């Protein structure tokens, strides 16, 4: 394929991807297929002469899309948002047109230094502390990983490596496989399953300690935990905290989670994947106590921050913790788990600049206030009760009466597909979660995911016989 | 940004890549900047106000491009390629536009089958044993990961878990800490920098056995080692073998390294990354000898197959393997190390098919070509030697003489950026590797590269004084 077809291809492409997203609620945003669907519709060897484009671009709204659950729609509701933006997939183009590889600095400075500088960006719009930047005096710093799954294995994973190398130099009698066979770690029962995966991942046990009520791990739990552990002759490694749980949103307490840890040398990470967006917001100040006393902190752009998916930031208060255990411009692939890096601060750079730090506000402010939209209606409606505080673009509610009211209300608006949810459960008690997910959500989305969710209770309720 | 907005700044996106791509060696393959020019050249905060995409575009070119090192040029001869393809780079900015992320089939359908289906077509293509296809009766399938670093990482861990639970179960008397302490596994001392790693990241040791003079590591080797720990009390893991070393080019001999791995019930992975394109030729049958024997095989498609970077192909034997340790359509968060998976196999059945199998096969014998070409030019010239047989893209030779002679040599290359290799080193000898990385490589730029370092060696040595 020469640069004319290429023009032709990517120009129709571009008109093909504008199209899609201006006119996605048009769709049902749960597909109707089943598994197999594509297997059965696709060849079973690749063509031996080549396609022509046209045709491609043409089965992929024939075959592909039907096989799409639309998460850039206004009425995914279902988990943290991808939303990605226009200038995210301009970026992330061009970066694929260079196809450059930043395993050192030679093997592209820009790759690197514009890491640097949008790490830095994103620090100050987040209200970091300052001495998680790069141009900060001391070894702080933040990095673009591939996931928060990445980001909290190379937290634990470090924590891990800092622990056997601190405590063996104390206690040389001990081998490695004593020490490494000592070792534990702790987390939220709220905390995400990256957390556990990294725990089979790091040969590490992360005990889920008990949140309040409340969803909330407090400083006395963990205390209690690591004097039961210590006192055991086991050693205390890494606390994950989580700032926006997946359930509730719930948001773990930082400063005495804090305290405790600094008291035991242990390291502390915050998931804040999704929550981290609101740290730009004065009206969230709170979320940010704490901030200055931990390790490192990891944020994901793709759920606040309209740079489509990938994109995951993870600031390190000392970097050289990450550096000596896997092994002024840093060299990043010691910051990270692989040995090449994708350019991805283009993207995150490119959307920045055309959006704006007010349009990036915006968004997250848009998202809160449509969360509040939606719990009004939930209020009013003497059939629906809350099961959690709102919180940023999250609302947990439930019909009133059994659990499976709500499963039936559920599988029927699976079945419809105008909208999608999924089901939780604390306690005994099954809930539904409505997340804003939208990168066009409007006021009047909100309505029509109101009116079909209680359109369906009504006929639920109207059909008991 | 709107959707008017996003189909002129994208069209013209479009258009800037098409003809950075068709005119790129015209410019310096590596740059002319000092570490720290872009952190001087851009702001410290992001903007308040978002900017015009026309101004951002401009400075791509302004600001960026003097910072890459351009790893699409012909004139890139550093490094196994990324190179890219026009298709390649429609079809990521395709997937971006779906912003879709594939950690359970309903999440997307497509995401997983259109993977089932295009690593079916790469593994009949690629010539590999049935037992890797999904369609095949048994539990092998290939999954897309990030990296080879990360499958090289998926399969060790893999095995790691396997080892201690297949151990513990047969001797529950043995504490977790005394096995997970005993275990060691192996790969050669020729192998990728990822499997060293991989072994840090995994806390298991990997010896790195020495290869034969010619580089290669041997089933007598590994069955020297493994007795040698098995007599020790030791646990034998896994052993890495590597088709395609980072240096020569070597090809580890796998029968051997089977038999005895059988023997010993040791998983056997092969770092395909590079020499994985050429299983597709007839006349590389030989690669292939003993693939129907290992556990896992990784290849790089952005290396051999014109897929942009990211895209490694994992082929697995048994995937339960990885799914018991880590926890008919697959589940492929489970064949992973993350949770959430990007929608990769878009770009790929997209290139693929835009391509043809024809075109893949040309793409690699075109390479192989070329190598042959130029290791042509390095026999006829009585002041250059052949430090290891030509193999696929990548002949290695040096100036006769002292090593010094070679390094001032690169040096003057570097200095001139028309081209860029990189010097290594084998007992003691070092060496220049020249490999063909085109997307776009023609038989006048192998002579480009030729008359630029025979040049450079006739005026070193003609001012020798």
Request: hydrophobic residues 40%; glycine residues 6%; negative net charge.
């Amino acid at each position: 394929m020469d640069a004319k077809e290429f023009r032709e291809f990517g120009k129709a492409a571009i008109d093909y991807i504008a199209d899609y997203l201006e006119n996605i609620r048009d769709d049902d945003v749960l597909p109707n297929v089943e598994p197999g669907y594509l297997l059965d519709l696709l060849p079973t060897e690749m063509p031996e002469e080549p396609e022509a484009w046209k045709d491609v671009l043409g089965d992929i709204s024939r075959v592909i899309k039907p096989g799409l659950t639309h998460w850039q729609s206004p009425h995914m509701h279902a988990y943290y948002p991808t939303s990605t933006s226009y200038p995210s997939i301009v970026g992330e183009m061009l970066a694929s047109g260079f196809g450059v590889i930043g395993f050192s600095w030679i093997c592209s400075p820009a790759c690197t230094e514009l890491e640097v500088v949008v790490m830095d960006w994103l620090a100050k719009f987040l209200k970091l502390p300052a001495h998680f930047q790069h141009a900060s005096d001391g070894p702080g710093g933040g990095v673009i990983q591939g996931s928060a799954s990445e980001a909290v294995l190379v937290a634990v994973l470090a924590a891990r490596e800092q622990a056997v190398a601190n405590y063996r130099e104390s206690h040389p009698e001990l081998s490695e496989s004593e020490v490494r066979g000592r070792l534990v770690a702790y987390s939220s029962d709220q905390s995400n399953s990256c957390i556990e995966k990294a725990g089979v991942l790091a040969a590490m046990p992360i005990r889920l300690l008990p949140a309040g009520e409340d969803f909330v791990l407090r400083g006395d739990t963990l205390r209690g935990a690591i004097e039961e552990d210590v006192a055991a002759g086991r050693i205390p490694v890494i606390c994950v905290a989580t700032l926006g749980t997946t359930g509730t949103c719930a948001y773990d307490d930082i400063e005495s989670l804090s305290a405790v840890c600094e008291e035991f040398k242990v390291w502390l990470h915050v998931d804040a994947a999704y929550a981290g967006g609101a740290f730009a917001l004065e009206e969230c100040s709170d979320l940010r106590k704490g901030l200055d006393r931990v390790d490192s902190l990891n944020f994901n752009l793709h759920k606040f921050m309209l740079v489509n998916f990938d994109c995951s930031a993870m600031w390190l208060r000392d970097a050289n913790k990450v550096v000596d255990s896997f092994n002024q411009i840093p060299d990043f692939r010691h910051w990270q788990i692989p040995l090449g890096r994708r350019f991805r601060a283009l993207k995150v750079w490119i959307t920045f600049r055309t959006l704006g730090a007010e349009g990036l506000r915006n968004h997250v402010r848009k998202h809160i206030e449509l969360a509040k939209q939606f719990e009004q209606l939930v209020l009013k409606d003497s059939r629906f009760e809350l099961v959690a505080p709102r919180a940023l673009g999250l609302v947990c509610f439930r019909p009133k009466g059994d659990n499976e009211i709500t499963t039936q209300l559920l599988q029927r608006l699976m079945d419809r597909k105008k909208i999608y949810m999924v089901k939780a459960e604390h306690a005994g008690r099954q809930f539904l979660r409505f997340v804003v997910c939208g990168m066009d959500t409007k006021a009047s989305d909100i309505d029509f995911a109101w009116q079909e969710i209680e359109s369906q209770l009504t006929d639920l309720q109207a059909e008991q016989s």
